[PDB]
Design an enzyme around this catalytic site. Structure first.
Site, PDB file in Angstrom:
ATOM      1  N   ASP A 126      12.662  24.427  53.995  1.00 40.44           N
ATOM      2  CA  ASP A 126      14.190  23.901  53.911  1.00 40.44           C
ATOM      3  C   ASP A 126      14.731  24.318  55.033  1.00 40.44           C
ATOM      4  O   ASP A 126      15.861  24.608  54.902  1.00 40.44           O
ATOM      5  CB  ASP A 126      14.712  24.175  52.698  1.00 40.44           C
ATOM      6  CG  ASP A 126      15.762  23.151  52.323  1.00 40.44           C
ATOM      7  OD1 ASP A 126      16.135  22.262  52.861  1.00 40.44           O
ATOM      8  OD2 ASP A 126      16.469  23.442  51.295  1.00 40.44           O
ATOM      9  N   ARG A 130      22.395  23.811  57.278  1.00 37.22           N
ATOM     10  CA  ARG A 130      23.007  24.604  56.420  1.00 37.22           C
ATOM     11  C   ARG A 130      22.356  25.768  55.793  1.00 37.22           C
ATOM     12  O   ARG A 130      23.125  26.538  55.219  1.00 37.22           O
ATOM     13  CB  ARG A 130      23.144  23.541  55.103  1.00 37.22           C
ATOM     14  CG  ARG A 130      21.665  23.317  54.569  1.00 37.22           C
ATOM     15  CD  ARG A 130      21.615  22.347  53.437  1.00 37.22           C
ATOM     16  NE  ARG A 130      20.242  21.775  53.172  1.00 37.22           N
ATOM     17  CZ  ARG A 130      19.785  20.633  53.920  1.00 37.22           C
ATOM     18  NH1 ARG A 130      20.367  19.944  54.593  1.00 37.22           N
ATOM     19  NH2 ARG A 130      18.243  20.428  53.791  1.00 37.22           N
TER      20      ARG A 130
HETATM   21  C1  LIG Z   1      35.110  32.144  54.751  1.00 34.24           C
HETATM   22  N1  LIG Z   1      33.533  31.966  54.687  1.00 34.24           N
HETATM   23  C2  LIG Z   1      33.216  31.480  53.190  1.00 34.24           C
HETATM   24  C3  LIG Z   1      31.648  31.246  53.178  1.00 34.24           C
HETATM   25  N2  LIG Z   1      31.103  32.174  53.867  1.00 34.24           N
HETATM   26  N3  LIG Z   1      29.642  32.402  53.874  1.00 34.24           N
HETATM   27  C4  LIG Z   1      29.382  33.444  54.537  1.00 34.24           C
HETATM   28  N4  LIG Z   1      28.093  34.281  54.539  1.00 34.24           N
HETATM   29  C5  LIG Z   1      27.084  33.926  53.806  1.00 34.24           C
HETATM   30  C6  LIG Z   1      26.965  33.130  52.970  1.00 34.24           C
HETATM   31  C7  LIG Z   1      25.790  32.896  52.182  1.00 34.24           C
HETATM   32  C8  LIG Z   1      25.717  31.838  50.958  1.00 34.24           C
HETATM   33  C9  LIG Z   1      26.663  31.758  50.190  1.00 34.24           C
HETATM   34  C10 LIG Z   1      26.271  30.878  49.096  1.00 34.24           C
HETATM   35  C11 LIG Z   1      25.171  30.338  49.014  1.00 34.24           C
HETATM   36  C12 LIG Z   1      24.091  30.343  49.926  1.00 34.24           C
HETATM   37  N5  LIG Z   1      22.891  29.669  49.854  1.00 34.24           N
HETATM   38  C13 LIG Z   1      21.911  30.029  48.813  1.00 34.24           C
HETATM   39  O1  LIG Z   1      22.017  30.899  48.085  1.00 34.24           O
HETATM   40  C14 LIG Z   1      20.665  29.229  48.824  1.00 34.24           C
HETATM   41  C15 LIG Z   1      20.035  28.256  49.782  1.00 34.24           C
HETATM   42  C16 LIG Z   1      18.684  28.081  49.550  1.00 34.24           C
HETATM   43  C17 LIG Z   1      17.961  27.107  49.963  1.00 34.24           C
HETATM   44  C18 LIG Z   1      16.671  26.503  49.834  1.00 34.24           C
HETATM   45  C19 LIG Z   1      16.304  27.186  48.194  1.00 34.24           C
HETATM   46  C20 LIG Z   1      17.130  28.314  47.902  1.00 34.24           C
HETATM   47  C21 LIG Z   1      18.233  28.424  48.288  1.00 34.24           C
HETATM   48  S1  LIG Z   1      19.517  29.644  47.524  1.00 34.24           S
HETATM   49  C22 LIG Z   1      24.097  31.344  50.946  1.00 34.24           C
HETATM   50  C23 LIG Z   1      23.297  31.544  52.057  1.00 34.24           C
HETATM   51  O2  LIG Z   1      22.013  32.249  51.488  1.00 34.24           O
HETATM   52  N6  LIG Z   1      24.875  33.873  52.365  1.00 34.24           N
HETATM   53  N7  LIG Z   1      24.804  34.992  53.068  1.00 34.24           N
HETATM   54  C24 LIG Z   1      26.131  35.036  53.936  1.00 34.24           C
HETATM   55  O3  LIG Z   1      26.211  35.841  54.789  1.00 34.24           O
HETATM   56  C25 LIG Z   1      30.378  33.946  55.225  1.00 34.24           C
HETATM   57  C26 LIG Z   1      31.457  33.191  54.785  1.00 34.24           C
HETATM   58  C27 LIG Z   1      33.176  33.161  55.298  1.00 34.24           C
END
Ligand SMILES: CN1CCn2nc(Nc3cc(-c4cccc(NC(=O)c5cc6ccccc6s5)c4CO)n[nH]c3=O)cc2C1
Length: 263
Positions: A126, A130
């Protein structure tokens, strides 16, 4: 296995395919992201069973999977925190500041990470802006590699579901679910197009099924204004109808370096 006592939860980071993700610290010092895996959202046995190999993938341009907490429910996945969030929103929010050299560097960052995964015969499945993250110094790293394999959500796992990454998928994935290095290659080409379009949606105003139809008839994403001919040739090489005509990430990295050298 990380000791959950060593984690300090600090901020909400939103929601992803497995539910809530938080920002916190490990042992008071290291910034981490912590996925709290929603029950019923993940094939947990399969993930725990194959989670060792994912921790041992180590590369500067991969968002590191530091470890897991599996002795309680929900299980936790603990990963490297990236202060600027995901690449797609970063592109769109800083749209008017990027120089073309920086766009190429982002493509190089991702390509290095994918060359590494390729050399480990490990599929992302994937890849997309994003699912790349950006740190506080503007370095792009590839995130959530391999996790699509564990998603329990028919809308995501079915090629006709609403969440399937149709717009990042080659014909053999949309028709036969044939994932390979070469389907990651296709997706990388689309990711280059996201970068050079500064975060536009691929095939905007087309539905997923119209997108599938389109690409099955040989039609491809247009060259974004900021992409040179050389750059477009690189992303276009990723979209050969036949998978075996697509480059490897090693070749793509050589191409990108060559364009950098010329500039
Ligand atoms: C002010 N801003 C707000 C948003 N913001 N966000 C930051 N930093 C990270 C976000 C995530 C994060 C957060 C939520 C969801 C996800 N995405 C997932 O969980 C998944 C993606 C997929 C794809 C395929 C299959 C299963 C999955 S599960 C992630 C990234 O993993 N993570 N890490 C980080 O550092 C830093 C900021 C500052």
């Amino acid at each position: 296995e990380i000791d959950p006592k060593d984690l300090t939860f600090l901020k909400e980071l939103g929601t992803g395919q497995f539910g809530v993700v938080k920002y916190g610290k490990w042992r008071g010092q290291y910034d981490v992201a912590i996925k709290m895996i929603k029950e019923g959202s993940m094939s947990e046995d399969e993930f725990i069973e194959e989670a060792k190999v994912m921790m041992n993938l180590s590369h500067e341009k991969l968002v590191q999977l530091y470890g897991v907490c599996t002795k309680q429910r929900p299980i936790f996945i603990i990963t490297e925190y990236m202060a600027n969030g995901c690449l797609l929103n970063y592109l769109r929010e800083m749209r008017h500041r990027f120089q073309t050299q920086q766009l190429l560097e982002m493509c190089k960052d991702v390509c290095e990470a994918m060359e590494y995964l390729e050399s480990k015969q490990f599929l992302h499945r994937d890849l997309a802006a994003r699912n790349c993250l950006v740190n506080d110094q503007g370095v792009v790293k590839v995130s959530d590699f391999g996790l699509s394999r564990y998603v329990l959500d028919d809308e995501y796992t079915s090629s006709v579901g609403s969440k399937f990454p149709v717009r990042w998928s080659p014909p053999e994935v949309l028709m036969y679910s044939k994932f390979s290095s070469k389907s990651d290659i296709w997706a990388f080409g689309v990711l280059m197009w996201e970068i050079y379009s500064l975060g536009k949606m691929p095939y905007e105003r087309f539905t997923n099924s119209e997108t599938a139809e389109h690409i099955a008839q040989g039609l491809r994403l247009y060259r974004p204004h900021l992409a040179s001919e050389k750059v477009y040739t690189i992303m276009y090489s990723c979209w050969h109808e036949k998978a075996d005509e697509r480059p490897t990430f090693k070749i793509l990295l050589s191409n990108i370096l060559d364009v950098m050298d010329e500039n």
